[PDB]
Amino acid sequence: RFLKVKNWETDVVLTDTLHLKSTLETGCTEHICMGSIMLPTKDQLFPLAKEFLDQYYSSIKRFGSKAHMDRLEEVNKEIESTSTYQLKDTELIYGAKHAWRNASRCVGRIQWSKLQVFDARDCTTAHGMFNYICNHVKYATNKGNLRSAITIFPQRTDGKHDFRVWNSQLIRYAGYKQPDGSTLGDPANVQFTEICIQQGWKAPRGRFDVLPLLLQANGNDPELFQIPPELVLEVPIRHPKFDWFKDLGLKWYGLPAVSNMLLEIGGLEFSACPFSGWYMGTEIGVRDYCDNSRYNILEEVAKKMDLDMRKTSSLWKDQALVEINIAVLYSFQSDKVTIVDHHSATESFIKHMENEYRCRGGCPADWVWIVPPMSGSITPVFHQEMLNYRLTPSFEYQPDPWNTHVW
Amino acid sequence: RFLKVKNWETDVVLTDTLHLKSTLETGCTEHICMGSIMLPVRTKDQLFPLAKEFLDQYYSSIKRFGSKAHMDRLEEVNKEIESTSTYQLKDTELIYGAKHAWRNASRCVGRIQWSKLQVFDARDCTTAHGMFNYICNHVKYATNKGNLRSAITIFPQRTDGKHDFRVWNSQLIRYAGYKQPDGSTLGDPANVQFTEICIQQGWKAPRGRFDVLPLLLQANGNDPELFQIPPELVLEVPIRHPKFDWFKDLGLKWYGLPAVSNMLLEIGGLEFSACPFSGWYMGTEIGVRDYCDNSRYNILEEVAKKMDLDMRKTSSLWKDQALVEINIAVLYSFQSDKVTIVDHHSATESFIKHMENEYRCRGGCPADWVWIVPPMSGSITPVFHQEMLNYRLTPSFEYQPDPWNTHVWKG
Ligand code: HEM
Ligand code: HEM
Ligand SMILES: N#Cc1ccc(CCNCc2ccc3ccc(N)nc3c2)cc1
Ligand SMILES: N#Cc1ccc(CCNCc2ccc3ccc(N)nc3c2)cc1
Ligand SMILES: C[C@H](O)[C@H](O)[C@H]1CNc2nc(N)[nH]c(=O)c2N1
Ligand SMILES: C[C@H](O)[C@H](O)[C@H]1CNc2nc(N)[nH]c(=O)c2N1
Ligand SMILES: [Zn+2]
């Protein structure tokens, strides 16, 4: 019941007690581990509120205070009357930071306490949402000196008045299916790119077209908005040794801003809560650029390097993968946009784990997601045992709004 | 209860029914996943169901389930258990058992080969010298002058746990490690503890960077004895790089035959505590882990210097760059010397096919993603994108404590 985790490179052992706080379920059982599976009312509401307020008031050293009981009382009365309740600004901020803190798949969590929270609960319209989102983007981008941020739209009520951002990220490239049978642009976004077209977007049908925003307010139908291009910071990708690399025509955007997740705090659900930090290089260089069902550029790059692609054993894919990832880091650094390599990031996370075990009693971590998609065992996290479990407040996945939406 | 796994690169969806035949525990609960944890004297009471379960499986596989020979065998085993407190496996059952233990090894990427396994029955063995002889033969057969053949040699099963056969080496062939007075380590740091034991037992260490360890063999619960594998049986490969001529001067080599000797083989409730087995290497085992783990030979820096990479910033990915060339060199050297080896692309691609085949013919394939995914270039291999389900089937290979921690010394 008190669990130990070992780092096999350093022999450092940490003891986990935080997992006993855990509430939600993992998908695993005594008979079967599902560690690699991608996706495993008033009476309900009050204990959830209570649990949250308990940890909030504990966090500020007023556990068992009059203010605690008063707030508990006040929220309790409000649930009985209104069937929901509203978070104080302080509670909202604490909740959002802690959702990030609890995100077991996030390697960047050492930054968790430095998050700018934008309260957009006064928003009533998609135009309003757009304004809030442009402000988020400009603030977080900060001319390339990225600052982590979250914008929080009104909470779910009866689920027929949901605020949703239909985009998966605020900034993403379109995907079009060709008559050639192939795919131009980002294959991951073909379906959404269609829905933008079905709703009226004029696609430029290019390789790297910034998608328009599809914004849903108060359960109404979604609307299109173009992010001012001046607010979309992008980085042309060159290699510091290969002059021909610039001719590949690649670029990426500086701001990773996930917009389709569900934020849960004290039993309350925020279905529209776009957040942003900054990239780890492998996200673009390894996954975005080299995944087969994505931009899939390995072959072309390999050819330009004139590698022996006859046999897999030449490790040409591995060679190319490295150089591509060099270029990404080099380009972002050269243009002064915040980015972190997989070595620096995983090393930070180890320090963060140690901080969390020391100061909190543990840290939930999904090894399958924390270990980078390249050079796994030369990063310290590979050798680090981790315990995965679900703490609240949390970020959760939710269905895509088109499968749900009653038009 | 049906269970679906998804490949997110191909959208291929597979349905697992095999997990229903699972008994052993994962270490996981509904409240916690221990998927990345490295490591999460039996009574006749608990022994017969295990025998029956095994024999039921065996006789199904040969399509004689419920036959008179099936029934008689259960009867025979039953009586032999209640008379002698244990039972002996037929040769056929032993072979079936060994192959299925490999087939069930969720952490093994090489399982496409599971049905090709040369089983050596060493259950008539009684002494350490006898173990040495069996092991020498295993090494010669499996090596086959570079054309490696998978094999396992199986020594007598545990009885009262006081007469265990154990091979004290973690692998039949492995390099010594020597801790120096200055804190540095000469040779393989992973083997410092075992090296020290050998030396204590009388081994005269050459004290070099690549000294092949002696065998330390324990028969029938007696104190272990030292033997030297004939050098002419130990196939080694000098590591050079196809374009970098200085790479040879690093002085690296490795042995050809990966042969794990410290695991426990469970078949029908019986425990085989000495069952060394061997296949062939995936390149990354040597080029990534053995050479590049900070706690192993740790050659990244010296290699990086020789390539003249920017080693001042990690964001140059000098480590990633040097890792690739080293792994190229390992593969190149083995292929050049015609010693069997497989790259991580080939191996993982084969595993996917094996896994799909297992789902179709067997109803599932238990697999440990954390272990199956190679330690470099993870997502450019197809296994990264494959959801897997991990669970325990018997027969199986299990870990067991190191014998020096448990052994009762005779003197
Ligand atoms: C500031 C620098 C940050 C870095 C370097 C970073 C790094 C990462 C990386 C590499 C992943 C894996 C994502 C993937 O492979 O698709 C991830 C996941 C995640 N991150 Fe972070 N992150 C940062 C900031 C943030 C912030 C500000 C939040 C929220 C407030 C956050 C919440 C999450 C969540 C919930 C996941 C899980 C993603 C999922 O389940 O789909 N991260 N992070
Ligand atoms: C024929 C070529 C083979 C290849 C390429 C191969 C590949 C591998 C690799 C790369 C690992 C991971 C080991 C590590 O990283 O420490 C592994 C694990 C394992 N293999 Fe295979 N293998 C082969 C044959 C065999 C055979 C013949 C057996 C037994 C009859 C076997 C049983 C196992 C078991 C039980 C593990 C788990 C290791 C552990 O838990 O420590 N493999 N294999
Ligand atoms: N199909 C699919 C499919 C693929 C990936 C994911 C998870 C994507 N998470 C992206 C994500 C989330 C948060 C992040 C925070 C920071 C950062 N640099 N990248 C981040 C990236 C889900 C479904
Ligand atoms: N400390 C430690 C520690 C390090 C490694 C392991 C597991 C090692 N597994 C080695 C292993 C086992 C079976 C194999 C089969 C074939 C092959 N090529 N390599 C194989 C390699 C456990 C504890
Ligand atoms: C099948 C497997 O769960 C899937 O490919 C996971 C593996 N680990 C990952 N890790 C990160 N960081 N991001 C991912 O998308 C994935 N995908
Ligand atoms: C802590 C973690 O489970 C440990 O480093 C594992 C990770 N995956 C592995 N995978 C393989 N094949 N071999 C290993 O030794 C390990 N080590
Ligand atoms: Zn699990």
Determine the CATH number of domain B236-258+281-346: 3.90.1230.10
Cβ neighbours of B238 (radius 10 Å): 12
Provide the token pair at B348: 């993982």
* B33 annotated ligand-binding residue: no
β-strand partners of B187: B177
Pairing of β B151-154 and β B118-121: parallel
Ligand 2 pocket residue status of B108, Cβ below 6 Å = yes
Residue ranges of domains in chain A: 16-121+148-158+262-276+346-370, 122-147+162-233+397-401, 234-256+279-344
Pick from A321, A283, A266: nearest CA to A299? A321
- B329 burial level (CB within 10 Å; 0-12, 13-18, 19+): buried
Report the alpha-carbon distance of residue B239 to residue B329 in Å, rounded.
6
Name the E strands within B306-402. 341-342, 396-398
What one-character-per-residue DSSP string does A89-140 give?
Answer: HHHHHHHHHHHHHT-TT-TTGGGTT--EEEE-TT--SHHHHHHHHHHHHHHH
Closest ligand to C-alpha of residue A400 is 3
Is the peptide bond prior to B189 cis by the omega test (within 30 degrees of 0)?
A: no
Chain A CA closest to residue B342? A313
* A30 annotated ligand-binding residue: no
For residue A383, report the phi and psi dihedrals to the nearest 5 degrees: -90, 5
Report the alpha-carbon distance of residue A87 to residue A93 in Å, rounded.
9
Q: Between residues 261 and 300 of chain B, which touch chain A (CB distance below 8 Å)?
A: 283, 288-289, 292-295, 300
Provide the token pair at A94: 């604490």
Cβ neighbours of B282 (radius 10 Å): 22
Pick from B37, B284, B393, B238: nearest CA to A367? B37
Name the E strands within A186-260. 213-216, 223-225, 234-236, 251-253, 257-258
Secondary structure of B122-174 in HEC code, one letter for each residue: CCCCCCHHHHHHHHHHHHHHHHHHHCCCCEEEECCCCCCCCCCCEECCCECCC
Cβ neighbours of A406 (radius 10 Å): 6
Fold annotation for A122-147+162-233+397-401: Nitric Oxide Synthase;Heme Domain; Chain A, domain 2 (3.90.440)
**Residue for token digits 């001319």?**
A143
Report the alpha-carbon distance of residue A217 to residue B127 in Å, rounded.
80
- This entry's atomic model was obtained through X-ray
For the stretch B11-16, contacts whose Cβ atoms lie closer than 8 Å and that sit 24 or more positions apart, written own/partner, are B12/B356, B14/B355, B14/B356, B14/B359, B15/B359, B15/B363, B16/B359, B16/B363, B16/B364, B16/B389
Name the closest-CA residue to atom 6, ligand 4.
B38
- Best of B33, B34, B341 to disrupt the A interface (most A CBs within 10 Å) is B33
Secondary structure of A348-402 in HEC code, one letter for each residue: HHHHHHHHHHHHHCCCCCCHHHHCCCCCHHHCHHHHECCCECCCCCEEECCCCHH
Q: Which of B39, B103, B104, B108 maximizes ligand 2 atoms within 8 Å of its Cβ, making it the mutation to test the pocket?
A: B108
Fold annotation for B16-123+150-160+264-278+348-372: Nitric Oxide Synthase; Chain A, domain 1 (3.90.340)
Q: Which of B34, B290, B371, B377 maximizes ligand 6 atoms within 8 Å of its Cβ, making it the mutation to test the pocket?
A: B371
* A57 annotated ligand-binding residue: no
State whether A318 and B377 contact (CB < 8 Å).
Answer: yes
Is residue A379 within 8 Å of residue A343, measured between CB atoms? Answer: yes
Report the alpha-carbon distance of residue B334 to residue A225 in Å, rounded.
58
Determine the CATH number of domain B124-149+164-235+399-403: 3.90.440.10
A to B CB pairs, distance under 8 Å: 205
Q: Which of A71, A91, A106, A356 is the catalytic position?
A: A106
Is residue A388 within 8 Å of residue A256, measured between CB atoms? Answer: no
Q: Residues near B297 by Cβ (< 8 Å), separated by ≥ 6?
A: B188, B252, B290, B291
Q: How far from chain centre, in Å, is Cα A268? A: 20
Pick from B101, B24, B94, B83: nearest CA to B55? B94
For the stretch B141-145, contacts whose Cβ atoms lie closer than 8 Å and that sit 24 or more positions apart, written own/partner, are B142/B118, B142/B257, B142/B259, B142/B278, B143/B233, B143/B235, B143/B256, B143/B257, B145/B235
Residue A344 Cα to ligand 2 midpoint, Å, equals 32
Report the alpha-carbon distance of residue A242 to residue B304 in Å, rounded.
20
Helices (H), ranges, A161-277: 190-198
Is residue B376 within 8 Å of residue A375, measured between CB atoms? Answer: yes
Provide the token pair at B37: 């944890």
| Amino acid at residue number B59 | Y
β-strand partners of A14: A5
Ligand 2 pocket residue status of B280, Cβ below 6 Å = yes
**Residue for token digits 């689920």?**
A159
Cβ contacts of A8 on chain B, cutoff 8 Å: 38, 295
**Residue for token digits 């921690």?**
B405
- A152 burial level (CB within 10 Å; 0-12, 13-18, 19+): buried
Q: Which of B379, B381, B386 maximizes ligand 5 atoms within 8 Å of its Cβ, making it the mutation to test the pocket?
A: B379
Is residue A71 within 8 Å of residue A43, measured between CB atoms? Answer: no
B40 at interface of A, judged by CB pairs closer than 8 A = no
Report the alpha-carbon distance of residue B74 to residue B87 in Å, rounded.
11
Residues making up chain B, counted from first to last: 411
**Residue for token digits 């998608």?**
A211
Fold annotation for A234-256+279-344: 3.90.1230
Pick from A271, A272, A273, A265: nearest CA to A88? A265
Helices A42-59 + A89-101 axis angle, to 10:
90
Is the peptide bond prior to B242 cis by the omega test (within 30 degrees of 0)?
A: no
Pick from B106, B231, B86: nearest CA to B163? B86
The conformational region for residue B242 under phi > 0 = left, psi -120 to 50 = alpha, else beta, is: alpha
DSSP symbol at A187: G
Is residue A382 within 8 Å of residue A376, measured between CB atoms? Answer: yes
Q: Residues near A207 by Cβ (< 8 Å), separated by ≥ 6?
A: A173, A184, A185, A249
DSSP symbol at B190: G
Q: Is B111 a catalytic residue?
A: yes
Report the alpha-carbon distance of residue B324 to residue A371 in Å, rounded.
18
Name the closest-CA residue to atom 3, ligand 6.
B36
Report the alpha-carbon distance of residue A104 to residue A265 in Å, rounded.
16
Report the alpha-carbon distance of residue B153 to residue B131 in Å, rounded.
10
Report the alpha-carbon distance of residue A319 to residue B332 in Å, rounded.
15
A367 at interface of B, judged by CB pairs closer than 8 A = yes
Name the closest-CA residue to atom 5, ligand 3.
A38
3-state secondary structure of B215: strand
Ligand 6 pocket residue status of A382, Cβ below 6 Å = yes
**Resolution, rounded to a tenth of an Å?**
2.0
Helices (H), ranges, B190-266: 192-201
Query: Which residue numbers come right before each break in chain B (C to N over 2.5 Å)?
Result: 40
Q: Residues near A125 by Cβ (< 8 Å), separated by ≥ 6?
A: A217, A218
State whether B38 and A8 contact (CB < 8 Å).
Answer: yes
Nearest to B30 among A28, A368, A373 (CB): A28
Question: b/e string for A66-105 if b means 16 or more Cβ within 10 A?
Answer: eebeebbeebbeebeeeebbebeeebbbbbbbbbbbbbbe
β-strand partners of B121: B154
Report the alpha-carbon distance of residue A313 to residue A240 in Å, rounded.
27
Q: Residues near B327 by Cβ (< 8 Å), separated by ≥ 6?
A: A315, A318, B283, B284, B287, B288, B376
Is residue A276 within 8 Å of residue A136, measured between CB atoms? Answer: yes
Is residue A298 within 8 Å of residue A321, measured between CB atoms? Answer: yes
Q: How far is CA A214 from CA A137, A171, A196, B37, B46, in A?
A: 15, 11, 7, 42, 62
Report the alpha-carbon distance of residue B411 to residue B392 in Å, rounded.
39
Report the alpha-carbon distance of residue A339 to residue A326 in Å, rounded.
12
Cβ neighbours of A293 (radius 10 Å): 13
| Amino acid at residue number B355 | M
Pick from A125, A121, A118: nearest CA to A154? A121
Is residue B272 within 8 Å of residue B166, measured between CB atoms? Answer: no
First to last CA, chain A: 49
DSSP symbol at B244: -
The answer as to CATH 3.90.340.10 being correct for domain A16-121+148-158+262-276+346-370 is: yes
For residue B7, report the phi and psi dihedrals to the nearest 5 degrees: -95, 120
Position in ligand 5 atom list of the atom nearest CA B387: 1
Helices (H), ranges, A156-279: 190-198
Report the alpha-carbon distance of residue A105 to residue A107 in Å, rounded.
7
Name the closest-CA residue to atom 30, ligand 1.
A100
Report the alpha-carbon distance of residue A389 to residue A20 in Å, rounded.
10
Report the alpha-carbon distance of residue A111 to residue A97 in Å, rounded.
10
* A369 annotated ligand-binding residue: yes
3-state secondary structure of A153: coil
Computed on alpha carbons and rounded to an integer, the radius of gyration of chain B in Å comes to 23
CA distance B18 to chain A (A): 11
